[PDB]
From a paper:
In the gene cluster containing the lin1839 gene, the lin1840 gene encodes a putative glycoside hydrolase family (GH) 3 β-glucosidase (BGL) (GenBank accession number: CAC97071.1). The structure showed that Lin1840r forms a dimer of identical subunits each composed of three domains. The active center of Lin1840r is located at the interface of domains 1 and 2 as in the cases of known GH3 BGLs.
To clarify the binding modes of inhibitors, Lin1840r-inhibitor complex structures were determined. Three glucosidase inhibitors, GDL, IFG, and DNJ, consistently exhibited competitive-type inhibition with Ki values of less than 1 mM. IFG showed the strongest inhibition among all the inhibitors examined, the Ki value being 4.1 μM. In complex structures with IFG and GDL, which are Glc analogs, the ligands are located at the same position as Glc, suggesting that IFG and GDL compete with substrates for subsite −1. In the case of the IFG complex structure, on the other hand, an unwound helix (amino acids 36–47) in domain 1 is inserted between the aromatic rings of Tyr583 and Trp271. Thr40 in this loop forms a hydrogen bond with the 6-OH group of IFG. This loop might be involved in substrate binding in solution.
Author numbering:
A (entry chain A): 1 to 31, 39 to 44, 46 to 724
B (entry chain B): 1 to 30, 39 to 44, 46 to 724
């Protein structure tokens, strides 16, 4: 409807209505993803509630919205939000696995299928993408990030927004698309010691340099909402951090949508010690520009008094309400509140076979082949497989942050494998035990067969929100099982399922091959069977570093040099940055992964010199020199050798996953704009300095050729 | 000499002499870091400003003599040294001294340290180390007094006072020496405990927690400051103009010699914030570094910088004047040999009085962690199986022991045989447990009645560039403790180490556990007196002992978070917790045991206070046992609501109280309004009205709690 008619609705609402418009509730409070409050809610509140989160189906939505609209004075429908993180009913790989795809289109398609399905079940908004930079795999929520690189995260974040939303300015018309909500603003992933909800602290320069850019990229691509974070940012809970949410989010990032609090985050500023009571919480959150309080009541019980007493301007409340109605209008809810459903059952769009094929393709793009000694893999279709371990038959392959997908529709590893291989003998074991009976049964299966598929992994409940692990290891009984299997003298493939980097040194050393499938989602067992038999060829690269040991954390590829770097020419000298007991290198680095193919790359002649403000054009010719078709991820990194700030030894600035038939050769070009060469300085200005840069072209952060470009002269 | 004659000397120096006055070299050029080709000339070494690392009185005299024969103007060298926790008489490592909670014990260590060092010709000590530490992977935790800014501040002042005494009389008091505060700033926050690694935190947090101990040492009159190896907000400290000009010289009104850490001027290159030695030199001198340690950026580049007009020579004169003013503060222009030349002071080194002082530090600094069922003290006739890698190892002096010698130290066996009549020793290796060790251990335990299991680190596993990713003893030591437990006899573990360690397995496999750290020269007597009860353990933890490596960083002064774990939400899902460990460290800050038992009570406090007013806290303590001992009364404040999320507690006062059996005492603390203040969002030091809780007790966990509402007017 016209902007004038929306603006008129704000004029017409009472104070109590405007207040309750800023409240979101779970469906069970209308006629959980967070702890529950005595909310002292009344009909006056529920009947003017702004939003519902967590509806369980289309029927739930229609029932709630109809009842609500019978009894709402002005005809303002509810907006319905949901956690669709890595799929709705067709579950795709967890986002950390999608990070490892290095494939923007895989990520967009995931989001598009997610939206297709979620809009079918009544959902208008998804609480995705999660754009938190992660350097600490103790934290359970790494599974939700695409990993340790700002650039990759930025790029995949835009891909998710574009997939969920399409053209943002046509969400009133395109009703298989939905609104994206960027979370969690900001820097939540830096939780101290990987402990859930724990203190975050870094300098404002670092926040800008590495922690904000991905939210910013998603905002600038048109993400309709932003969600606040649970953590302090420089000592102030993000939810009532005026500087962060007014100066940065609304000012510098020019964000003009709805700012929804995370679950109880408005009330929690009390626990955090930056508000004495719900009256103070409310005032501070509304001053900071939080528009929508998720499942707490500080606003409804306190805004009136704050405004009547003059401690808060009612203009702040009117702008929140206006952003709330503008959203609803952007989704076309004033002309169709059921958003395509009312007369048109879309159950047919949910869990189609086409969608399953897309999830499966996502799986095989995202898995990461870490070891493959002696061309153990791919296996022949007639290989006789002993399939053993806690992930042989476990249906727990859909991953964390799976609110809507069902395990009964998922494909386990055994089922996946029997579709492809004629001879399979299974011995399932428990996640945390290794009994003598297990060992006898394992030994018999392995004696019968020719190759072992050892299926190891985490339960998904060991990560996600409030799934922090101090030691990033599998249960010891799984390391014992891999050590037992190894004594049996048959080649072993370990297929590892998990949601965070783990200490995998002992697994790599106890097996011939190691494949990291993360949690692929609905099609897990087929993803696994296709990669193992070679129908698909592994093409994923690590988006997060796999530490030598828990105590190496944080370790990441974009790290600073220090004043005493370890060089191969000072090996064994005492006075160098090193540990006494481990290497400085992570066990597996960012951008690392194997293939059944072999590639050669050649970078075209680059200029020695470049002007400031000028783009560097990087041309790369890649050939598949093997007889197996496959995909390689070309990666381009930049380093700034001398700067007014100590800059990282490398930073990814471009990537492209190139598909190549056997013998096939392609050329790809990359533009590194002058923004790629820029950084935040001491005074927090985004700057470009004359000087030397090194450009690295290759297939990991370690397997690269190096080139020198001198930037100076005049400015373009 | 008079200020005018100093100033005049600067006026009379040539440019090359001014440049070279800002160079410090090791004795061999007339090691505590890597060496460069320095391309040094006679003109360089004849005008050098300073020597570090002289190895005796004679070395120094030799060097000053030769040097003074060729220096054109008669400007003597100043000699600096690493005297960190002792010279020849070695005291406990500073982390152990932290656990003393005893200011006076720390001042004496420092006084004895100066007494000895000045005897060997040293004018300056690169002590105190005042880096806040929250990460025990870092080897240099041994050199800090631990995780608390206040305790570090307080003990930091104690050390400055002990080395220096009256700073205005260092030309007169020749048994005292200049202190150099290090490492400015925040070096201890190295990422993942990796040596020299990135440091990053918000400026507010730098002010709130990382800066105050350096500041307290500066205000107490520390004569020098040393730069740190790490970046601070992305810029190597050494060339960090903001840090060194604005904060150090401006806010902290520091007006002495700023010395670089070893090669740190040149290493800004590696850090990537200077292209080359000319850039390094220019930026370090801008930042106000007066003395380049054992690199040559200044020597080879200041001239060209100045002539080219990229640097003003006034910055150089300012650096030179500071150098001369130190020498003059130390009295070198009247006596270049600083009391040595005719008065030989060998007599003052390693005396028995000094030894008794180090033993005393030892018994003040050890921490008794477990003592199940009155195993300790042991009866002097107790028959002891003494086993393990620290049974006989002479490696008990600690890291950062440049000058002390192991032959003069007392090992655990020797200490023990002085007190106990029956001891059977079985020495094992630090990283192995052989079948043969086990047969020999089994037989000694069978013979005796109680096991003294002596476990520990070699000192080379910490100190500078002694980072461990996993904070555990060699697995063979935990195996040994497990084996001993199976033999059925009571076990005391005496643990020797320079860092917090995962000791849950050691506490569970033993009846008593005593943390000696590295006590120094008297280690074996320290151990023997505590075990026999001649001394009663009185140390408390100045650093938290994590449940596991993966808990790090864990510390008592932590923020609440938005979802704190409360007793009334246990095992609920949505609370800050780990799935596999508790939130609490294995042992907390301020924890430790005694063979006595104490009762405390706090007199009535006001419910309200004016802004700017002090809270006066009166505490009556009684020893209610038959055993004389000491307790450390500790007072914490919390700021329940503030414009910045504040820690759940912060230490603001402590006093170690000595009590005979039955004795009772009253001690009063003043908490000034500054103890109620903190750094805000805009980096202002502030006091806000509101509620504070006050906690009085004997650890961060064993406390009574009292509320005070601050507001009203300002005093
Ligand atoms: O369910 C809504 C939200 C709850 N708290 C954590 C968020 O990631 C989630 O979207
Ligand atoms: O030896 C002098 C200096 C060397 N580098 C580290 C410092 O702590 C030390 O005092
Ligand atoms: Mg540069
Ligand atoms: Mg307060």
């Amino acid at each position: 409807m016209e902007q004038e008619k929306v603006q008129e609705l704000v004029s017409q609402m009472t104070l109590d209505e405007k207040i309750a418009q800023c409240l979101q509730l779970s469906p069970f409070l209308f006629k959980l993803t967070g702890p529950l409050l005595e909310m002292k809610l009344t009909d006056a509140h529920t009947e003017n509630a702004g939003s519902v989160l967590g509806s369980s189906s289309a029927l739930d939505m229609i029932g709630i919205q109809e009842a609500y609209l019978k009894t709402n004075r002005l005809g303002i429908p509810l907006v319905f939000m949901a956690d669709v993180i890595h799929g709705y009913k067709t579950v795709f790989p967890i986002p950390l696995a999608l990070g490892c795809s290095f494939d923007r289109e895989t990520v967009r398609v995931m989001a598009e299928v997610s939206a297709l399905e979620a809009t079918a079940d009544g959902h208008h908004v998804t609480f995705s993408p999660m754009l938190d930079l992660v350097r600490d795999p103790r934290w359970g929520r790494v599974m939700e990030s695409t990993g340790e690189d700002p650039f990759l995260n930025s790029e995949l974040g835009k891909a998710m927004v574009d997939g969920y939303q399409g053209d943002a300015s046509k969400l009133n018309e395109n009703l298989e698309q939905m609104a994206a909500c960027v979370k969690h603003f900001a820097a939540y992933g830096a939780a101290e010691a990987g402990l859930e909800y724990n203190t975050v602290n870094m300098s404002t320069r670092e926040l800008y340099q590495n922690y904000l850019p991905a939210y910013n990229a998603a905002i600038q691509a048109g993400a309709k909402l932003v969600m606040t974070a649970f953590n302090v940012v420089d000592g102030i809970p993000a939810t009532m951090n005026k500087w962060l949410n007014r100066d940065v989010l609304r000012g510098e990032m020019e964000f003009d949508g709805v700012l929804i609090s995370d679950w109880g985050a408005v009330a929690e500023v009390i626990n955090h010690g930056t508000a004495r009571n719900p009256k103070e919480a409310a005032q501070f959150s509304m001053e900071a520009g939080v528009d929508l309080e998720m499942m707490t009541t500080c606003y409804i019980h306190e805004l009136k008094g704050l405004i009547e007493e003059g401690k808060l301007s009612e203009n702040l409340l009117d702008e929140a309400v206006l952003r709330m109605l503008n959203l609803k209008n952007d989704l076309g809810l004033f002309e169709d509140p059921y958003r395509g459903l009312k007369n048109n059952d879309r159950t047919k769009d949910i869990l189609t076979d086409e969608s399953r094929g897309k999830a499966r393709a996502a799986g095989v793009e995202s898995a990461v082949l870490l070891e493959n000694k002696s061309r153990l893999l791919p296996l022949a279709k007639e290989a006789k497989i002993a399939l053993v371990g806690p992930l042989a038959t476990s249906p727990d392959i859909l991953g964390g942050w799976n609110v809507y997908g069902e395990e009964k529709d998922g494909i386990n590893v055994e089922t996946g494998l029997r579709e492809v291989f004629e001879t399979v003998e299974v011995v399932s074991t428990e996640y945390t035990e290794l009994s003598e009976e297990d060992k006898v049964a394992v030994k018999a299966a392995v004696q019968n067969m020719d190759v072992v598929v050892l299926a190891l992994g985490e339960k998904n409940e060991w990560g996600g929100e409030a799934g922090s692990l101090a030691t990033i290891r599998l249960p010891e009984a799984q390391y014992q099982l891999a050590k037992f299997v190894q004594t049996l003298g048959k080649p072993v493939v370990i297929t590892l399922f998990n949601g965070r980097p783990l200490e995998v040194k002992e697994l790599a050393e106890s097996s011939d091959a190691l494949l990291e499938l993360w949690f692929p989602g609905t099609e897990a067992g087929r993803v696994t069977a296709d990669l193992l038999s070679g129908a698909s060829n592994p093409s994923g690269k690590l988006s997060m570093s796999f530490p030598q040991t828990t105590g190496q954390i944080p370790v990441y590829y974009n790290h600073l040099r220090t004043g005493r770097p370890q060089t191969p020419e000072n090996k064994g000298e005492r006075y160098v940055s090193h540990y006494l007991d481990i290497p400085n290198e992570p066990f597996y680095p960012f951008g690392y992964g194997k293939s059944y193919s072999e590639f050669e790359l050649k970078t075209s002649s680059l200029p020695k010199e470049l002007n400031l403000g000028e783009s560097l054009h990087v041309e790369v010719t890649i050939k598949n020199i093997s007889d197996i078709a496959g995909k390689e991820v070309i990666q381009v990194y930049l380093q700034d050798v001398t700067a007014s700030i100590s800059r990282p030894v490398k930073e990814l600035k471009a990537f492209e996953k190139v598909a190549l038939q056997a013998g096939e050769e392609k050329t790809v070009t990359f533009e590194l704009t002058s923004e790629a060469f820029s950084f935040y300085n001491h005074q927090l200005e985004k700057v470009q300095e004359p000087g030397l840069h090194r450009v690295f072209v290759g297939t990991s952060s370690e397997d690269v050729d190096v080139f020198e470009v001198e930037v100076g002269g005049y400015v373009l």
